[PDB]
Scaffold this motif. Structure first.
Motif: not given
Lengths: 49, 49
Positions: A37-40, B28-30, B39-49
Protein backbone atom coordinates in the motif's frame (compact mmCIF):
# COMPACT_ATOMS: atom_id res chain seq x y z
CA UNK A 1 -35.12 6.67 20.48
CA UNK A 2 -32.05 8.92 20.52
CA UNK A 3 -30.05 6.74 22.94
CA UNK A 4 -31.27 3.26 21.88
CA UNK A 5 -29.75 1.35 18.95
CA UNK A 6 -31.03 2.14 15.46
CA UNK A 7 -31.63 -0.98 13.32
CA UNK A 8 -31.37 1.01 10.06
CA UNK A 9 -27.58 1.42 10.35
CA UNK A 10 -24.94 -1.13 9.31
CA UNK A 11 -23.88 -1.22 12.97
CA UNK A 12 -26.24 -1.03 15.95
CA UNK A 13 -25.21 2.41 17.21
CA UNK A 14 -27.67 4.99 18.47
CA UNK A 15 -28.13 8.44 16.83
CA UNK A 16 -26.20 10.09 19.66
CA UNK A 17 -23.53 7.38 19.54
CA UNK A 18 -23.05 7.92 15.80
CA UNK A 19 -22.78 11.68 16.35
CA UNK A 20 -20.21 11.01 19.08
CA UNK A 21 -18.24 8.68 16.80
CA UNK A 22 -18.18 11.22 13.97
CA UNK A 23 -16.61 13.94 16.16
CA UNK A 24 -13.37 12.12 17.07
CA UNK A 25 -10.85 11.77 14.24
CA UNK A 26 -8.56 8.79 14.79
CA UNK A 27 -5.31 8.12 12.93
CA UNK A 28 -5.90 4.48 11.89
CA UNK A 29 -8.92 3.74 9.68
CA UNK A 30 -8.47 0.04 10.34
CA UNK A 31 -5.42 -1.88 11.49
CA UNK A 32 -4.28 -3.63 8.28
CA UNK A 33 -1.83 -1.44 6.33
CA UNK A 34 -0.13 -3.61 3.73
CA UNK A 35 3.48 -3.28 2.62
CA UNK A 36 2.43 -2.75 -0.99
CA UNK A 37 0.00 0.00 0.00
CA UNK A 38 2.90 2.37 0.76
CA UNK A 39 5.89 1.37 -1.38
CA UNK A 40 7.79 4.19 -3.05
CA UNK A 41 6.96 7.89 -2.75
CA UNK A 42 4.04 7.16 -0.41
CA UNK A 43 6.60 6.47 2.32
CA UNK A 44 8.02 9.53 4.12
CA UNK A 45 4.67 11.17 3.28
CA UNK A 46 2.24 8.95 5.23
CA UNK A 47 2.87 9.25 8.97
CA UNK A 48 1.59 5.74 9.76
CA UNK A 49 3.93 4.12 7.22
CA UNK B 1 63.21 18.92 1.51
CA UNK B 2 59.92 17.04 1.61
CA UNK B 3 57.13 17.17 -0.96
CA UNK B 4 53.66 17.34 0.62
CA UNK B 5 50.49 16.79 -1.41
CA UNK B 6 47.22 17.52 0.40
CA UNK B 7 43.96 16.20 -1.05
CA UNK B 8 40.63 17.82 -0.18
CA UNK B 9 37.12 16.55 -0.88
CA UNK B 10 33.60 16.14 0.49
CA UNK B 11 31.80 12.82 0.78
CA UNK B 12 28.23 11.71 0.03
CA UNK B 13 26.48 15.08 -0.17
CA UNK B 14 26.83 16.21 -3.79
CA UNK B 15 27.14 14.65 -7.25
CA UNK B 16 30.59 13.15 -7.74
CA UNK B 17 32.83 12.79 -10.78
CA UNK B 18 35.99 10.94 -9.65
CA UNK B 19 34.96 7.64 -8.00
CA UNK B 20 37.19 4.62 -7.44
CA UNK B 21 38.26 1.60 -9.48
CA UNK B 22 35.22 -0.52 -8.56
CA UNK B 23 33.20 -1.91 -11.47
CA UNK B 24 29.49 -1.21 -11.76
CA UNK B 25 26.66 -3.65 -12.44
CA UNK B 26 23.09 -3.58 -13.75
CA UNK B 27 20.09 -2.04 -11.99
CA UNK B 28 17.55 -4.37 -10.38
CA UNK B 29 14.17 -2.90 -9.46
CA UNK B 30 11.21 -4.08 -7.37
CA UNK B 31 13.43 -6.39 -5.32
CA UNK B 32 15.44 -6.40 -2.09
CA UNK B 33 19.03 -5.61 -3.08
CA UNK B 34 22.16 -4.13 -1.56
CA UNK B 35 23.12 -0.97 -3.42
CA UNK B 36 26.23 1.21 -3.74
CA UNK B 37 25.27 4.55 -5.32
CA UNK B 38 28.33 6.80 -5.67
CA UNK B 39 29.76 5.35 -2.46
CA UNK B 40 26.51 5.22 -0.47
CA UNK B 41 25.75 1.68 0.71
CA UNK B 42 22.46 0.35 2.00
CA UNK B 43 19.59 -2.07 1.57
CA UNK B 44 16.08 -1.59 0.24
CA UNK B 45 13.73 -1.78 -2.72
CA UNK B 46 14.31 0.59 -5.64
CA UNK B 47 11.32 1.87 -7.61
CA UNK B 48 10.80 4.56 -10.22
CA UNK B 49 10.27 8.10 -8.95
Amino acid sequence: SQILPDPSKPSKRSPIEDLLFNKVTLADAGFIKQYGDCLGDIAARDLIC
Amino acid sequence: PYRVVVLSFELLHAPATVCGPKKSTNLVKNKCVNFNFNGLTGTGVLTES
